[PDB]
Symmetry: D2
Subunit: 328 residues, 4 copies
């Protein structure tokens, strides 16, 4: 449980650039002209695993002891965290086992194996895959790699915000997607240590708003049901350490429905020619709603395209909603 000062030094020490790279901060030209603001996208889809999660996973796994590395790492994931851990394991020479639910698509399982990870199909949902991963952790001595709730993982995602401040120090507000809150905690703790004038706003899907629920209650709480449309942010309970940072450093939170998310997927395809996954377009959808609700004009605003690992046939849903939005 470090203070902001220690987090800043951990962000600097995190060796993310042995696996991840500095990603472009690109102006969205069509959307900037339309919304009377300078809107910039942090293109985390350009990482080797096509999401940001490589940063925190590699940071945590490089920081393990020689003993822990020799016994390998385990985790449970539906996709993006699995590719982060598989890729980091190949680079570090460490055995990695990823438990995924039995219903996981072959393309996702293949991607994890292609990056050098061992895959175990187990469980009817993510909760049963995580139970198997923790059980196997204690039984066979694998080290558990948490997808968000860990200071070294938060520091790793914080490298993203450090790049932002050097790529554009005149930023006014940064919009961050939230699942368990690893990324939001890293961005918010880093920015509040270096350039606290910049507003950090968390964005959540309406049917997956576990941080909003935790903020309302004043502590982490379980959601009764989590929507599955945005896979990456389908988290039932915000993390303990991530909530501590988010409750302390976030300036605001906003929620958006499936329609806004799909509109943002279309916006990013037309402005930067990338197909974001729904959780990758989430922060943009929040920013667009924030801009209208608060009548924001003349500012420099950034959102994180956090991932672009999309199911091809799953794009039918996104495109159908976009067609339905045209009819109105």
């Amino acid at each position: 449980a470090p203070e902001g000062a220690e987090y800043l030094r951990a962000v600097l020490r995190a060796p993310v650039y042995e696996a991840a790279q500095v990603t472009p901060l690109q102006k969205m030209e069509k959307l900037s002209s339309r919304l009377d603001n300078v809107i910039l996208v942090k293109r985390e889809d350009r990482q080797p695993v096509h999401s940001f999660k490589l940063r925190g996973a590699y940071a945590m796994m490089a920081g393990l002891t020689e003993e822990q590395k020799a016994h390998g790492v385990i985790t449970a994931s539906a996709g993006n965290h699995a590719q982060g851990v598989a890729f980091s394991s190949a680079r570090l020479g460490v055995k990695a086992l990823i438990v995924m639910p039995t219903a996981t698509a072959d393309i996702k399982v293949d991607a994890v194996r292609g990056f050098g990870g061992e895959v175990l199909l187990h469980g009817a949902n993510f909760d049963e895959a995580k139970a198997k991963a923790i059980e196997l952790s204690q039984q066979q001595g694998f080290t558990w790699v948490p997808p968000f709730d860990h200071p070294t993982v938060i520091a790793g995602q914080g490298t993203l915000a450090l790049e932002l401040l050097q790529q554009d120090a005149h930023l006014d507000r940064v919009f961050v997607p939230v699942g368990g809150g690893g990324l939001a905690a890293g961005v918010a703790v880093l920015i509040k240590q270096l350039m606290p004038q910049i507003k950090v706003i968390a964005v959540e899907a309406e049917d997956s708003a576990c941080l909003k629920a935790a903020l309302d209650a004043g502590h982490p709480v379980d959601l009764p049901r989590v929507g599955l449309f945005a896979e990456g942010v389908a988290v039932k309970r915000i993390g303990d350490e991530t909530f501590r940072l988010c409750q302390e450093y976030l300036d605001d939170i906003i929620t958006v429905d499936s329609d806004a998310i799909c509109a943002a997927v279309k916006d990013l395809f037309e402005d930067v020619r990338a197909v974001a996954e729904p959780s990758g377009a989430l922060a943009l959808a929040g920013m667009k709603k924030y801009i209208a609700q608060h009548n924001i004009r003349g500012e420099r605003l950034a959102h994180i395209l956090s991932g672009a690992n999309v199911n091809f046939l799953g794009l039918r849903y996104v495109l159908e909603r976009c067609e339905l939005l045209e009819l109105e």
Copy 2:
């Protein structure tokens, strides 16, 4: 430079200054498709060009070859898509005025793409034919040099640089599959390869409802098609070019046609193997190759196709995805 022989085309391909605007594009193995089809299946990534289609090669070679008088008088063409984007980019890079005529009903995103590349756009006509008629009239009135989309020896040599790159990126290639609209790309690839590695088979691929080259090969000369399908916009060509048909009839090894559903399946294959979203004409050649592999029971070979373009309407993707879902 009116009806050149093979040796004169070869030297023309070396002389085309395409690398002042275009770039050498990757030749990638499609891993999933290669393991599934028992061949090494490679894709030439022409979507990686600055205008996201190969048409920059022919347009820039032809426009850079014009006299100092013609350049000072500017160029003109009629197009709503890739050819217009290639002419606009070339004119910006050569510092030459370019006017592009499009039908008044053309979508804003198409018009703005050509404008963003540096081309003046004149909206005129109720269809492509009237847009072309205006452009030819303005060519006679105001002295613009018309830039043909395929039927020109310098345009053909410009596209031929694609095949010269292929021979250096993989000289162990067995067969190359090429989409055909008016025949410019196929003529350049065929004449180049038959001058340097004649043992490589070059096979043209056409949409069933847009096969003006199969019609011209059946008749022995260029003929007009009654109706042309519009699904694959890039290859919606009513009549093959005179010079391209001369080279295609002389140097092609085979031709094949595929229906809309085969194209849609190819779009899905390219999104899952190389993470690109091809437009229908850009997946045409892969559709052609997959039918050819099955009809001829081909195994253990090295086969290449050209992803010729990736300028896609986002909302147009829902038909492609609907057909893919019906395909299982």
Copy 3:
């Protein structure tokens, strides 16, 4: 006189990456095994102008007022600062006049002109060139671009240190060449705000040690004579604001002679295939002498290759001294 926190925010705000770029931090293999330390070199020669000075020049010039750019900028420089101001003016669309001594090599003034700067040849030495530059500045109203003594110039150079910390946070010590003191002040203030456990060592040539003289006296002092071998560090008086920061944040200082500098040129050519100018190999020379004097083993030590704009014929002196060392 900003505080450490203000310098940190100034470093982050410095728009240096509109002109300069992030330079490699390379390991020197041959030297590392020989001296039993991991020795890293920051390759500032890889900047478009082939010295670090682009960072501070562009930051200061981008930060003027629209009125100041309309009137233009002036500076006096013998080489590397001139190419930084020339390049920054072309990128910013600003008029730049550079006063250089009449004896400046044609290759140096052509490089400044090639980068898009007006050159005025005047003066028997750098002093008379600076005097004419300040004179034209008061008369015609050109904004003077200081080579080192300016918070925004210092903040610009500080971006080098911020890169170092993200490229290797397990560094033990960083060795910095010192002329006027802007780079050493940027590097030292930045690192002491973020990773104060890291040691920052200034390195000066013996016949140009105006920071050593200033530290001995407790204030900036004038040097009677300054050696001209290492052109970039041939400064007679340390800057006021750079001295304040250097006195406050530096961990140590060391001086070296012409033989050490020439030996460090040979080292850099054989390990990383670069021809450093004498000022660019200076920090390495200090590092080697520091390692021996303090018996340093098993540490991670970085120096800055600050520039590689060498007069070809001027290399005879360096090669001559290296042959004498070989004998």
Copy 4:
């Protein structure tokens, strides 16, 4: 003894881009203004081993059978060829032994070891190291990787000329340095198959003109003494196949003295900021002499910076000659 058409197909089939890269063709701005020609330099010093030799070595080594690769490769070289063979062996996963004279400088032995080659120091000169290389080849079954006299080596270097034609098709003349003639043969045969109107001119140091000697006699002869200043072109006898191709396809040959080479080293340092070794500046020197001898103006002229693996202390002699000029 393949024909021109066969070499062309060899150049296309050479898999050089698995180890080597397409190098820049750069205009020399200062020298182009001074000499009233567009003077372009092909920067083969930017190859991973800092010489063109990685092209020929990788193409030959990749063309070996699986059994040959399993038995390993051997060569004799104290400089650039050693680094090319070493680097190719690391990319192909093949064992390589390199025999070098016992007096070879440490930095040269370490550069070959760093690229992944086994070094055996043996012999009082190059001839004694080569004899040990062939001996170890005949006993243990190492495949001998020739530095120049081999059709696949020649076709590997010829990729350099195929790049040149696509980088600038309005080239008038190309100048190539010659040691054993593998580079010149590959460049000359490639260009004469595709754009024969382009002149190819061999350049040789006077102290090492084994190709001019072979052309005078009409067949490969032995040079009595060879100059060692330009190490990479210090070859006693032109190859058999490289001479056959050079004699048929070159347009001209020109020699230069040491001072011309030194002046060219200074020109390249001031125009492109590289320190060429003497063999790498040889082509430029020949081109400057050619330009004056034939009053060439307003043309597009290319030379090959063939290598920049230089001895630092050796620069003292070059610098002294440049000050005297």
